[PDB]
């Protein structure tokens, strides 16, 4: 029934998330403006949105209990291969089922399927991404479950390149138990039915998205004119 340490962790993550995810999306105004006038017209603005996002996810990961104890190189492997996934996960907070899109305080900062298509993305990528957002939303997770899911996604032991898996897995386990115990205590029915199973699954879907949307990246960065319109961080983290 939630130990004191497990409440400690929950509080850490909720605060960490709060310090890394602004609901007013004020900074969005410092991005290169969006253009919906024009192939790839939305590449600069989203490039910047993602780049900004990569940063917040990094700041979020540092506040994950036990993540600091990790080796430097490991910390790199985990963020380098989870970033896209966590961005997609954290983005469910601005995703609305009304018109199926990511609303961020205004129409100008509201991104629909056709705006993502303006960043060089076919439906073979978008279709699944949307299915995801809808499925993840349907879960109606609690902010606690939400921030835990992200953390658990970042500290995954099977990521290629991990050297101290045993240590990483130990970090994950602690987190999973906190979510499982939490789903039992603070989540009533039918709000906690296979709630943990549908979640672990969403992690599998993510891996599938990663694989798919990463290949597209190489297809887009492979052209120097396109690569030229991204940011440094994006090139560093997503490969160069």
């Amino acid at each position: 029934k939630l130990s004191e340490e497990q409440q400690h962790i929950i509080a850490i993550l909720l605060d960490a998330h709060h310090k890394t995810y602004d609901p007013t999306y004020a900074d969005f105004r410092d991005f290169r403006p969006p253009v919906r006038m024009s192939p790839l017209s939305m590449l600069p603005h989203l490039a910047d949105l993602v780049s900004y996002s990569i940063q917040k996810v990094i700041g979020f990961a540092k506040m994950i209990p036990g993540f600091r104890d990790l080796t430097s190189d490991d910390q790199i492997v985990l963020l380098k291969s989870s970033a896209i996934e966590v961005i997609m996960l954290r983005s469910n907070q601005s995703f609305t089922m009304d018109d199926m899109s990511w609303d961020c305080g205004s129409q100008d900062y509201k991104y629909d399927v056709t705006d993502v298509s303006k960043a060089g993305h076919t439906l073979e990528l978008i279709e699944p991404l949307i299915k995801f957002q809808v499925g993840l939303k349907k879960l109606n997770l609690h902010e606690e479950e939400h921030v835990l899911l992200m953390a658990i996604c970042i500290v995954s032991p099977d990521r290629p390149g991990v050297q101290d898996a045993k240590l990483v897995e130990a970090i994950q386990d602690r987190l999973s138990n906190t979510l499982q115990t939490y789903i039992r205590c603070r989540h009533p029915p039918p709000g906690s039915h296979q709630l943990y199973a549908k979640m672990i699954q969403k992690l599998a879907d993510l891996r599938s998205l990663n694989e798919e949307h990463s290949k597209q990246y190489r297809s887009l960065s492979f052209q120097p004119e396109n690569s030229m319109k991204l940011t440094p961080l994006v090139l560093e983290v997503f490969g160069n």
């Binding site: 940063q55 990094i58 540092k62 963020l79 961080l233 983290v237």
Partner: peptide
């Protein structure tokens, strides 16, 4: 591979 920027955001 050397990730100066990612490395700086962590530390």
């Amino acid at each position: 591979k050397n990730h100066p920027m990612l490395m700086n955001l962590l530390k």
